[PDB]
Design an enzyme around this catalytic site. Structure first.
Site, PDB file in Angstrom:
ATOM      1  N   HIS A 225     -31.593 -38.830  93.055  1.00 22.91           N
ATOM      2  CA  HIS A 225     -30.133 -38.824  93.117  1.00 22.91           C
ATOM      3  C   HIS A 225     -29.552 -37.454  92.835  1.00 22.91           C
ATOM      4  O   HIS A 225     -28.333 -37.270  92.979  1.00 22.91           O
ATOM      5  CB  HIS A 225     -29.529 -39.951  92.276  1.00 22.91           C
TER       6      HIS A 225
ATOM      7  N   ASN B 177     -29.416 -20.995  76.730  1.00 22.60           N
ATOM      8  CA  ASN B 177     -28.008 -21.171  77.063  1.00 22.60           C
ATOM      9  C   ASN B 177     -27.850 -20.938  78.563  1.00 22.60           C
ATOM     10  O   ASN B 177     -28.067 -19.821  79.047  1.00 22.60           O
ATOM     11  CB  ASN B 177     -27.173 -20.171  76.269  1.00 22.60           C
TER      12      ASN B 177
ATOM     13  N   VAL C   5     -25.761 -17.888  79.768  1.00 22.86           N
ATOM     14  CA  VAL C   5     -26.097 -16.545  79.322  1.00 22.86           C
ATOM     15  C   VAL C   5     -27.491 -16.188  79.804  1.00 22.86           C
ATOM     16  O   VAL C   5     -28.406 -17.008  79.722  1.00 22.86           O
ATOM     17  CB  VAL C   5     -26.035 -16.443  77.789  1.00 22.86           C
TER      18      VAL C   5
ATOM     19  N   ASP D 276     -36.321 -43.369  91.997  1.00 24.48           N
ATOM     20  CA  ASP D 276     -35.412 -42.235  91.793  1.00 24.48           C
ATOM     21  C   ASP D 276     -36.239 -41.023  91.374  1.00 24.48           C
ATOM     22  O   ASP D 276     -36.291 -40.625  90.205  1.00 24.48           O
ATOM     23  CB  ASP D 276     -34.327 -42.589  90.776  1.00 24.48           C
TER      24      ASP D 276
ATOM     25  N   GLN E   6     -24.661 -38.063  81.420  1.00 24.24           N
ATOM     26  CA  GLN E   6     -24.355 -37.317  82.630  1.00 24.24           C
ATOM     27  C   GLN E   6     -24.731 -35.851  82.467  1.00 24.24           C
ATOM     28  O   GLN E   6     -24.446 -35.234  81.442  1.00 24.24           O
ATOM     29  CB  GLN E   6     -22.872 -37.459  82.970  1.00 24.24           C
ATOM     30  N   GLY E   7     -25.374 -35.290  83.492  1.00 24.82           N
ATOM     31  CA  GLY E   7     -25.848 -33.921  83.452  1.00 24.82           C
ATOM     32  C   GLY E   7     -27.283 -33.786  82.998  1.00 24.82           C
ATOM     33  O   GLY E   7     -27.872 -32.717  83.164  1.00 24.82           O
TER      34      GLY E   7
ATOM     35  N   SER F 225     -29.570 -35.968  84.172  1.00 23.64           N
ATOM     36  CA  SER F 225     -30.357 -36.629  85.208  1.00 23.64           C
ATOM     37  C   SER F 225     -31.361 -35.669  85.820  1.00 23.64           C
ATOM     38  O   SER F 225     -31.094 -34.476  86.007  1.00 23.64           O
ATOM     39  CB  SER F 225     -29.444 -37.174  86.301  1.00 23.64           C
ATOM     40  N   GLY F 226     -32.528 -36.206  86.135  1.00 20.61           N
ATOM     41  CA  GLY F 226     -33.585 -35.427  86.695  1.00 20.61           C
ATOM     42  C   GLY F 226     -34.487 -34.799  85.664  1.00 20.61           C
ATOM     43  O   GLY F 226     -35.588 -34.363  86.014  1.00 20.61           O
TER      44      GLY F 226
HETATM   45  N1  LIG Z   1     -27.017 -43.512  79.686  1.00 19.04           N
HETATM   46  C1  LIG Z   1     -27.884 -42.735  80.289  1.00 19.04           C
HETATM   47  N2  LIG Z   1     -29.091 -42.584  79.798  1.00 19.04           N
HETATM   48  C2  LIG Z   1     -27.514 -42.025  81.488  1.00 19.04           C
HETATM   49  C3  LIG Z   1     -28.452 -41.262  82.283  1.00 19.04           C
HETATM   50  C4  LIG Z   1     -27.858 -40.595  83.314  1.00 19.04           C
HETATM   51  S1  LIG Z   1     -26.160 -40.898  83.349  1.00 19.04           S
HETATM   52  C5  LIG Z   1     -26.242 -41.918  81.991  1.00 19.04           C
END
Ligand SMILES: NC(=[NH2+])c1ccsc1
Length: 223
Positions: A40, A54, A57, A84, A174-175, A177-178
């Site tokens: 995804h 970081n 940076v 996925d 969120q962020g 993922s992967g």
């Molecule tokens: N609640 C989670 N673990 C999740 C993973 C990606 S977006 C939310």
């Protein structure tokens, strides 16, 4: 990552940031030229960023390498998030060192109860939004398949597992993922989905990497 801790610079040397002008997903370096991420997260124009702490940076250990190709799993379903997983090839091999290093694929599937390390640059809030610029870490156990299916009726396939805490407060978000779920030094999961983040009875759901080792190895061998 919600409810985690600051990993420390370059302490997760297989963690990568996928960048398309900005960080949008994590990934895991599995050899000098290949990254595993979530299907995804697929998009055009990916640059793989290794050695990051970081992400805003340039601190001195980074390698920024554009992808030459990406391969989404042939059975990925974007509605259910079944399968996925995707592979991303680097245009040039990364220079491996103590701070940029591959993570081994699993020899066997990990069991419920095993402790794992989940990491990423995603949102740190369950309500609202705050992005951390340094890498965050969370130690979390794999949950039983029965408790995972009970938490998400009709949504958990054989290619997913839950990890985290049914009481809430600690989760990926969120962020993230992967990115990686590493257990006993092996990549067992990919951050995939959840309902919100760190909500009670809504643990994180992760792609079950052990099901994909044959596909990963065969795909790398011919691409
Ligand atoms: N609640 C989670 N673990 C999740 C993973 C990606 S977006 C939310």
């Amino acid at each position: 990552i919600v409810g985690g801790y600051t990993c420390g610079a370059n302490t997760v040397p297989y963690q990568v940031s996928l960048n398309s002008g900005y960080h949008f997903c994590g990934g895991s370096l599995i050899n000098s030229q290949w990254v595993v991420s979530a299907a995804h997260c697929y998009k055009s124009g990916i640059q793989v960023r290794l050695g990051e702490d970081n992400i805003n940076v340039v601190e001195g250990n980074e390698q920024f390498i554009s992808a030459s190709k990406s391969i989404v799993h042939p059975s990925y379903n974007s509605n259910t998030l079944n399968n996925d997983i995707m592979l991303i090839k680097l245009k040039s091999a990364a220079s491996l060192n103590s701070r940029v290093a591959s993570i081994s694929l699993p020899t066997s599937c990990a069991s419920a109860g095993t402790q794992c390390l989940i990491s990423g640059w995603g949102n740190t809030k369950s309500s609202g939004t705050s992005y951390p610029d340094v890498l965050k870490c969370l130690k979390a156990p794999i949950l039983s398949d029965s408790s995972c299916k009970s938490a998400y009726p009709g949504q958990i396939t054989s290619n997913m597992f839950c990890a985290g805490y049914l009481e809430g407060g600690k989760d990926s978000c969120q962020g993230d993922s992967g990115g990686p779920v590493v257990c006993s030094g092996k990549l067992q999961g990919i951050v995939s989905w959840g309902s919100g983040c760190a909500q009670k009875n809504k643990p994180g759901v992760y792609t079950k990497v052990c099901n994909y080792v044959s596909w990963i190895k065969q795909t790398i061998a011919s691409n």
